[PDB]
Design a protein around this ligand. Structure first.
Ligand code: CLA
Ligand code: CLA
Ligand code: CLA
Ligand code: CLA
Ligand code: CLA
Ligand code: CLA
Ligand code: CLA
Ligand code: BCR
Ligand code: BCR
Ligand code: PQN
Ligand code: PQN
Ligand code: SF4
Ligand code: SF4
Ligand code: SF4
Lengths: 29, 724, 106, 32, 105, 106, 153, 69, 80
């Protein structure tokens, strides 16, 4: 129970990895 | 993502996947254009790391340190760097780690400041500039990515041009940043010098000299040299100083930093002149003039026939990146060893003559990196001879004539390596054996009269045996002794400074040994590049590349035959030879710090004096970092010295025993994996294999290097800070 | 199977016997960890093989009626024979004999 | 300065989560 | 710290006495031991490329021996390597076990 | 010897003779053998020369002069009956009968 | 750096070395024959210092010397201890080279390197005046070689 | 066309044995690209004696006939 | 995997398949040699590259070359 902003940063890092896969799928955009 | 390396159902794929990750010329689908492009991007991704790490160096000094308490009393206050925080550390050791000024645990600074300058006090100052440096580094990276984007790529006619940035990049960097550097060091850091604080709003309003510009504009005389400065000086109080553009002493200044920023200001004046004389030389050598000959891509000219131009034939040197790297890491290495040699006789820092631990850490740092750059230059030179050389084009010159008779050169180099050994080490064995028998006088002592002549050049007028600068009446001595020679003679006639020390036996025989090791190292670095396309043991060596195991264990054996094997052999000599130079240099200061110079020139003649007085006596405060009683500050270092001998000896696992034994053992481990119940459900991905014959020696060289580096990185700090 | 058994035995006797060396050398340079290791220093050492020496102390007379002395004075406790210089001593194990004996076994 | 009130109290996880994250990220990359 | 360090006071501080040979052999056994580091690390391929240059100098003056100069065998190099790693790796402790025990005898 | 100043190795041991100290246990073995006078050293040495020569004239006998067949070596049964009884047995008995009549001089 | 007959800091080393040797010298009885040789050994010690004093020697007591070619010190380098090494070594080397010239012929080359007739080893004494004759024969070696070397390809 | 048993000089496009003196073991008319085997005294690292060689290789080594007294 | 390339120095003394462990090479009738055999390696996919034919290869410079290439399960000689 410490560092709430760090928890949000770890969560957004996992979401950025998922969005990276989505970016690979989009490609042309 | 290399496909040929991808189809490798073993763990080895990852190793080269990181080992050949920077090996861009051997990736799959590699072309001529993409090589320079991605390597250019790595240049920009490398300088960005340098500036990010510089920003961190400045950030931790701003956030932690007693530098404001240091500028007042810089001798007594021991310098600090960054705070230490570790829940593993015992309180008994942290009570000794915290000493000096701060209350928090802070380590001892080793990287002593080069940019002395002012300090900008402590009011929202250094972390802002560090953030600006970091953001400039990031934008530098983003600018590289901007160049990578389509339609914004520079063509090959931007790197491979005699008429290109070889002109404007040269005369433009250390020239604009020369007038800027001079104008922003001797005037921006003139408050640190004298105390003439100037806000960044009126550079014109604040002239340091009594008169500015107008005396310089006159062609008769600068009217700036007729101004001396008093010896008494403080950063805040001038103490009788009479400002001048040039303030040369010619001698050891009271404050160790330069000569009142003389040397400093003279640099970029000379460097700007270096560009004024160079930027005009090669500018017309280029001319941006396309060749009139259309015999280079037309239908009319086919086949080989003739070259593109008798003067133009230099594409093998400009097209190849390994040759350009072999020269960029070579000339910089010449200047690197020169820079290292110019940090003990001409110290540009203040209070280095009074400091002890910090000085011994910077010289050997640049010394080891000098040896590194030398090896990198020669390794890429070998790669240039393998993947880029062509005997059909460079025929009839002197470069192709070399390797038609190079065996004679290798013979002379081998003879030198044997000669300097049988006598240097032979003398050493005589020294030890005759000193052991109780007869140090029977020892065949040696006197480097050549190196003693350097002391005669210092202007001593009491010698009297027809040596240089032995009489002030000689016209050669009278010539140009009007201004700076008075400080010269006064600065060298002292046993307290390091301007040309005394030289004798224990001083010569090590220089003889350094010549031995360096000449041997030179031969080893050169022959590996010469016999790179082929030899008598293996003439098809060109039919592979740089990193390959062997040709086959037959015909006597081809163990360690590739050019990469020559590199892996060369690194061993690098560490030991560059360690000989340091083992020698570590006595030329600890002998005078204790004042007992009679220890060296009397005991260093034999190796036993090197064994008992250095590897044993100086290591007392090192090993006594954490005695079985009260551990103190030198604990972390006394631990590293052990962790070093671990990592170093860890390399002996990868170097003494080869790879097949590990194959036969890993197969037993894999058998036990699936045969064991419960654990049989767990399955891997890439098949477990041992390291490659090339990667084995490379990783073991990594251990033999970093373990040896830490072996000497822990002894210096503790042994020098234990006795001072 | 033979070498697989010996392999795991070697690794267990290595990651501990020399592992404990890394451990203790860490505890000292780290600080107060070696201080709290003293109770463990009482462990292992004088825990095993101590009773073997005590067997040999009481071996004469009891399990050796025709012997008026032990196998060697390295067994007899507090019994020291000196001829101007010490000949043998009741080798009181302790501190790190369990350490070096397992470096040996490794 | 900050002493024991600003950034040094959040460092414990900063100096260790990036190693764990880096090994995890590179392992996910090689698993691809 | 207390073992390999305090022993130099009985092996080196003996030149003024009669135990000087155990210091020379001590410092000279490291020589042959590190001389084993020449064979246990390098390979016959590079050294065989090293002879043929010397044999070229030997063919320049015809001073090349009839017995064709070749490198050591791949197995013989390791046999000599362990021979020196042991000889240089025993004579040091041979000089050490015979160093202190005479001074503290 | 005095050639190159090496006479510093002559350790002052005492007994009117200087030289190099020995750690081979020769003096302890000789004292445990009852040897006192120097004459008993030379007689043993001259008696060792004879046994040393006889073995050269033996290894040169069963070969260039004689030679047992191959059948003489499969007698491992007859070999252990002479190594455990002729060498180990008579050896442990011959030296036993010595230190019973040579113990009292020590 | 002054010579040791005038360097007061060198004779003190002679006194100090004999002083360290004297404590070992006095513990034993001088009348014993096995230790009467120590006086002859210290006689060798004494007879050694006087010759080195003539050579310029370090003020510290560590006796230095000259290799620049100075005619006053040619005895430490140039003439004696140097030229004889060159001659003696090369008297062996050019003798070996002459044996290399006679290393061919009909009898096997391996037999004429190793199992040589002792007579060639007895002829070794031929080279009294190597210099220029050896230079002629080494010219002929390079000549008859006719640049016949290894490929290095 | 030259007679067998001639003293050879190796000028093979690959093996730069710059005129290593050797003798022709035999001459074969089978007509291939690398036929001639010669006694090569310089025992290569492989260990054998005679290897195959081209038609280039040797032209002549005596160079004289009647002026060679 | 590995890349097998046969020189023109072949004498056809079958030294390859004699030495060779898993029979990478193969003797084929040829019209330009003394004995009349030539070594050919069809099963280069199964080649391991142990380099034991260059030992038995007679010629001054060997006649059977195998340049080191990629590594697969067939070329690593592993049983798992
Ligand atoms: C200006 C510095 C510099 C730069 C930009 C390069 C760049 C390069 N080097 Mg190089 N090198 C350098 C200095 C440098 N080197 C120095 C100082 C040495 C002497 C120690 C070497 C010795 C060297 C060798 C032997 C090799 C290279 C190779 C390479 C290429 C691939 C690198 C690699 O294998 O992965 C990166 C390597 C590492 C990250 C280091 C290994 C593991 C560390 C310890 C972590 C690459 C373009 C390889 C090559 O050109 O292929 C033929 C090659 O084999 N270098
Ligand atoms: C302490 C260990 C040790 C010792 C004693 C030597 C000694 C020697 N090495 Mg060597 N080397 C070593 C370690 C060592 N090496 C290691 C660890 C490596 C890397 C694996 C190398 C790699 C290496 C290479 C590549 C070469 C040498 C060469 C030489 C010889 C010429 C150098 C010389 O000074 O002339 C002789 C000095 C003497 C005192 C002769 C010794 C006479 C004895 C004591 C009697 C010499 C005998 C060179 C060579 O082969 O010579 C032509 C050569 O090219 N070494
Ligand atoms: C300080 C250097 C060093 C270190 C730390 C090691 C450590 C180790 N070696 Mg090694 N070795 C070394 C030097 C070293 N060796 C050298 C120089 C050689 C050449 C003679 C060898 C040759 C060698 C062989 C042939 C073998 C080992 C094995 C092992 C492992 C034993 C298993 C174990 O107990 O794990 C404990 C971990 C630590 C103690 C840390 C172990 C990790 C054995 C193995 O693989 O396991 C059975 C094995 O067979 N070593
Ligand atoms: C030609 C290059 C060269 C030379 C001249 C030397 C010379 C020496 N090395 Mg060294 N070494 C080299 C290359 C070289 N090394 C390389 C490339 C490596 C690998 C990086 C090593 C690694 C190495 C190690 C690990 C050690 C040495 C040591 C030594 C010293 C042995 C002391 C001795 O007995 O001398 C002569 C003294 C005498 C008294 C003669 C004895 C007379 C008897 C009694 C007769 C010696 C002066 C050892 C040392 O002393 O540590 C500093 C040591 O342990 N070397
Ligand atoms: C260049 C510095 C250097 C180097 C490379 C070495 C290297 C070595 N030393 Mg040494 N030592 C040094 C300096 C050095 N020492 C100094 C300055 C001293 C004090 C004068 C000693 C005193 C010393 C002693 C008393 C002994 C060694 C021993 C050893 C060997 C260890 C044998 C081994 O690994 O088995 C395994 C060892 C362990 C696992 C521990 C090794 C080769 C030992 C030896 O040589 O045995 C023959 C040994 O007895 N050293
Ligand atoms: C070439 C010089 C030399 C020779 C010929 C001898 C010969 C001898 N020594 Mg000695 N020693 C020497 C040098 C020499 N030493 C040096 C420099 C020292 C250090 C100061 C010592 C220290 C020493 C001790 C402490 C002892 C001897 C002893 C002995 C005797 C035992 C036999 C033996 O060891 O066989 C040879 C052993 C070998 C391993 C050589 C065989 C292996 C191959 C041939 C090499 C023997 C007659 C012992 C004795 O009792 O003296 C009578 C004894 O205890 N020696
Ligand atoms: C149970 C067997 C045994 C045992 C325990 C001993 C024990 C002993 N013997 Mg001995 N010896 C034996 C068998 C044995 N011997 C045999 C069979 C012979 C005939 C070759 C000898 C011949 C012999 C001689 C000539 C001498 C000794 C001596 C000694 C004493 C000191 C030597 C030593 O420590 O090495 C002990 C050896 C072993 C422990 C190995 C024996 C193990 C067997 C194979 C079981 C010692 C108490 C010395 C002595 O009398 O002291 C003054 C002495 O000079 N022994
Ligand atoms: C001025 C002066 C002087 C003089 C000098 C002289 C007389 C000269 C010189 C100089 C020099 C002379 C220097 C140098 C250096 C060098 C180096 C450092 C080298 C190098 C080389 C290289 C680097 C190479 C590389 C490569 C290879 C090997 C491979 C391939 C190719 C290549 C090229 C890449 C003096 C000092 C006396 C004094 C002061 C003044
Ligand atoms: C030191 C030495 C030496 C010298 C000398 C010698 C050699 C010795 C000896 C010795 C001897 C000389 C020994 C012995 C032997 C003996 C014996 C071996 C015995 C016996 C007896 C018996 C066996 C008995 C039996 C019986 C009977 C019959 C009766 C009843 C029963 C019974 C059983 C008791 C030398 C240097 C040379 C070398 C070696 C060592
Ligand atoms: C142990 C050993 C192996 C086996 C090596 C293996 C299995 C590598 C083990 C690595 C493990 C997974 C730990 C790796 C982590 C390191 C502690 C640090 C690396 C982290 C980064 C620097 C990459 C060889 O393959 C070998 C080959 C040739 C000569 C000697 C040897 C040898 O001694
Ligand atoms: C030096 C070296 C060689 C060459 C080793 C040689 C040439 C051994 C030389 C030893 C002899 C004894 C020296 C030559 C002396 C002659 C016998 C002449 C002696 C005549 C009188 C002095 C008696 C290898 O073959 C080798 C192989 C694999 C890894 C490393 C190496 C390696 O380091
Ligand atoms: S590296 Fe290994 S496989 Fe290659 S020649 Fe050497 S021992 Fe043989
Ligand atoms: S190794 Fe070469 S010469 Fe021998 S049989 Fe095979 S192809 Fe022919
Ligand atoms: S490459 Fe290896 S497996 Fe293939 S034929 Fe040659 S020796 Fe045999």
């Amino acid at each position: 129970m410490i560092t709430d902003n760090q928890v949000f940063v770890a969560l957004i890092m996992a979401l950025v990895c998922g969005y990276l896969a989505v970016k690979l799928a989009k490609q042309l955009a | 993502f290399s496909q040929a390396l991808a189809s490798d159902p073993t763990t080895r794929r990852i190793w080269y996947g990181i080992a050949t990750a920077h090996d861009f010329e051997s990736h799959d689908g590699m072309t001529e254009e993409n090589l320079y492009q991605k390597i250019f991007a790595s240049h920009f991704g490398h300088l960005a790391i340098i500036f990010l790490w510089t920003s961190g160096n400045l950030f931790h000094v701003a956030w932690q340190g007693n530098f404001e308490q240091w500028v007042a009393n810089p001798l007594k206050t021991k310098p600090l760097a960054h705070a230490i925080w570790d829940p593993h550390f015992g309180q008994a050791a942290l009570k000794a780690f915290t000493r000096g000024d701060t209350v928090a645990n802070i380590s001892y600074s080793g990287v002593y400041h080069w940019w002395y300058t002012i300090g900008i006090r402590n009011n929202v100052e250094l972390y802002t500039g560090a953030l600006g440096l970091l953001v400039l580094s990031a934008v530098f990276l983003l600018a590289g990515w901007l160049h990578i984007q389509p339609k914004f790529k520079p063509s090959l006619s931007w790197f491979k041009n005699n008429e290109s940035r070889l002109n404007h990049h040269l005369a433009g960097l250390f020239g604009v940043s020369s007038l800027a550097w001079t104008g922003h060091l001797v005037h921006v850091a003139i408050p640190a010098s004298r105390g003439q604080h100037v806000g960044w709003d009126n550079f014109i309003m604040t002239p340091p000299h009594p008169a500015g510009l107008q005396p310089f504009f006159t062609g008769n005389w600068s009217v700036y040299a007729q101004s001396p400065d008093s010896m008494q000086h403080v950063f805040g109080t001038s103490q009788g100083a009479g400002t001048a553009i040039l303030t040369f002493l010619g001698g050891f200044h009271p404050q160790t930093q330069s000569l009142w920023l003389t040397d400093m200001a003279h640099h970029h004046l000379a460097i700007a002149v270096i560009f004024i004389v160079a930027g005009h030389m090669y500018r017309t050598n280029f001319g941006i003039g396309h060749n009139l000959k259309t015999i280079l891509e037309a239908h009319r000219p086919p086949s080989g026939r003739l070259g593109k131009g008798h003067i133009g034939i230099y594409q093998t040197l400009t097209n190849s990146l390994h040759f350009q790297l072999g020269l960029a890491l070579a000339s910089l290495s010449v200047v690197t060893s020169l820079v290292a040699q110019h940090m003990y006789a001409m110290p540009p820092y203040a209070y280095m003559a009074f400091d002890y631990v910090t000085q011994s850490a910077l010289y050997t740092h640049h010394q080891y990196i000098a040896g590194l750059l030398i090896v990198g230059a020669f390794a890429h030179g070998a790669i240039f001879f393998i993947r880029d050389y062509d005997p059909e084009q460079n025929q009839d010159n002197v470069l192709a004539r070399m390797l038609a008779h190079k065996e004679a050169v290798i013979s002379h180099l081998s003879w030198v390596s044997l000669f300097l050994g049988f006598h240097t080490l032979g003398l050493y064995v005589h020294n030890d054996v005759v000193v052991a028998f109780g007869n140090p006088e029977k020892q065949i002592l040696i006197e480097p009269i050549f190196a003693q002549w350097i002391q005669a050049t210092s202007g001593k007028m009491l010698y009297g045996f027809q040596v240089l600068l032995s009489s002030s009446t000689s016209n050669a001595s009278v010539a140009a002794q009007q201004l700076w020679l008075p400080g010269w003679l006064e600065a060298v006639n002292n046993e307290s400074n390091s301007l040309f020390l005394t030289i004798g036996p224990g001083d010569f025989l090590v220089h003889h040994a350094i010549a031995l090791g360096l000449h041997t190292t030179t031969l080893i670095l050169v022959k590996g590049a010469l016999d790179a396309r082929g030899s008598k043991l293996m003439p098809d060596k060109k039919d592979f590349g740089y990193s390959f195991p062997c040709d086959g264990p037959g015909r006597g054996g081809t163990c360690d035959i590739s050019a990469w094997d020559a590199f892996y052999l060369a690194m061993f000599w690098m560490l030991n030879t560059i360690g000989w130079v340091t083992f020698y240099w570590h006595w030329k200061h600890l002998s005078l710090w204790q004042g007992n110079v009679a220890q060296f020139n009397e005991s260093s003649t034999y190796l036993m004096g090197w064994l008992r007085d250095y590897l044993w006596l100086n290591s007392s405060p090192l090993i006594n970092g954490y005695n079985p009683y009260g551990m103190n500050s030198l604990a972390v270092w006394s631990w590293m010295f052990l962790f070093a001998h671990l990592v170093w000896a860890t390399g002996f696992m990868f170097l003494i025993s080869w790879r097949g034994y590990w194959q036969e053992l890993i197969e037993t481990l894999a058998w036990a994996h699936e045969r064991t119940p419960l654990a049989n459900l767990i399955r891997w991905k890439d098949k477990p294999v041992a390291l490659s014959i090339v990667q084995a020696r490379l990783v073991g060289l990594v251990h033999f290097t970093v373990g040896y580096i830490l072996t000497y990185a822990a002894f210096v700090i503790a042994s020098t800070a234990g006795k001072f | 199977a033979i070498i697989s058994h010996l392999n795991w035995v070697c690794i267990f006797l290595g990651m501990h016997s020399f592992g404990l060396y890394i451990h203790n050398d860490t505890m000292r340079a780290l600080g107060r960890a070696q201080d709290m290791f003293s109770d463990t220093a009482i462990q292992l050492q004088p825990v095993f093989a101590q009773w073997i020496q005590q067997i040999h102390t009481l071996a004469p007379g009891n399990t050796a009626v025709n012997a008026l002395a032990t196998a060697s004075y390295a067994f007899g406790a507090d019994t020291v024979t000196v001829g101007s210089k010490i000949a043998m001593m009741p080798i009181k194990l302790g501190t790190a004999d369990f350490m070096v004996h397992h470096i040996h076994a490794f | 300065m900050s002493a024991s009130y600003l950034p040094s109290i959040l460092v414990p996880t900063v100096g260790l989560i990036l190693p764990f994250a880096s090994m995890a990220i590179l392992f996910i990359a090689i698993e691809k | 710290r207390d073992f390999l360090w305090a022993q130099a006071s009985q092996v080196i501080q003996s030149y003024g006495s009669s135990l000087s040979a155990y210091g020379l052999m001590f410092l000279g056994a490291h020589f042959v031991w590190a001389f084993s580091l020449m064979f246990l690390f390098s390979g016959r391929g590079y050294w065989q490329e090293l002879i043929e240059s010397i044999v070229w100098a030997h063919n320049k003056l015809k001073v090349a021996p009839a017995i064709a100069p070749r490198a050591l065998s791949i197995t013989q190099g390791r046999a000599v390597g362990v021979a020196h790693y042991l000889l240089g790796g025993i004579a040091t402790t041979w000089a050490f076990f015979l160093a202190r025990i005479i001074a503290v005898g | 010897w005095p050639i190159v100043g090496q006479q510093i190795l002559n350790a002052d041991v005492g007994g009117g003779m200087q030289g190099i100290q020995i750690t081979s246990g020769l003096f302890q073995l000789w004292r445990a053998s009852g040897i006192v006078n120097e004459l008993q050293l030379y007689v043993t040495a001259l008696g060792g020369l004879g046994m040393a020569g006889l073995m050269i004239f033996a290894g040169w006998f069963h070969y260039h002069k004689a030679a047992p067949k191959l059948e003489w070596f499969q007698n491992v049964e007859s070999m252990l009956n002479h190594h455990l009884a002729g060498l180990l047995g008579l050896g442990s008995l011959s030296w036993a009968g010595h230190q019973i009549h040579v113990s009292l001089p020590i | 750096l002054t010579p040791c007959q005038q360097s007061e800091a060198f004779h003190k080393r002679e006194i100090n070395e004999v002083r360290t040797l004297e404590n070992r010298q006095a513990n034993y009885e001088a009348n014993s024959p096995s230790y009467l040789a120590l006086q002859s050994q210290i006689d060798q010690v004494h007879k050694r210092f006087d010759k080195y004093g003539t050579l310029l020697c370090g003020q510290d007591g560590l006796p230095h010397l000259i290799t620049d070619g100075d005619w006053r010190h040619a005895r430490e380098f140039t003439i004696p201890a140097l030229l004889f090494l060159y001659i003696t070594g090369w008297i062996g080397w050019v003798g070996r080279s002459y044996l290399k010239y006679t290393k061919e012929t009909k009898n096997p080359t391996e037999q004429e390197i190793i199992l040589d007739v002792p007579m060639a080893l007895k002829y070794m004494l031929s080279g009294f005046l190597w210099p220029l004759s050896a230079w002629q024969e080494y010219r002929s070696g390079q000549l008859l070689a006719k640049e016949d070397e290894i490929t290095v390809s | 066309m030259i007679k067998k048993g001639s003293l050879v000089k190796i000028l093979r496009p690959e093996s730069f044995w710059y005129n290593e003196v050797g003798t022709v073991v035999n001459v074969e008319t089978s007509k291939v690209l690398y036929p001639v085997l010669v006694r090569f005294d310089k025992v290569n690292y492989s260990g054998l004696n005679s290897t195959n060689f081209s038609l280039d290789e040797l032209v002549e080594i005596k160079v004289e006939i009647k002026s060679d007294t | 995997a590995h890349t097998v390339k046969i020189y023109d120095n072949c004498i056809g003394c079958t030294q390859c398949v004699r030495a060779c462990p898993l029979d990478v090479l193969e003797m084929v009738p040829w019209d330009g040699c003394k004995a009349g055999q030539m070594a050919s390696a069809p099963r280069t996919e199964d080649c391991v590259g142990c380099k034991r034919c260059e030992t038995a290869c007679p010629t001054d410079f060997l006649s059977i070359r195998v340049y080191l290439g990629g590594e697969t399960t067939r070329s690593m000689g592993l049983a798992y």
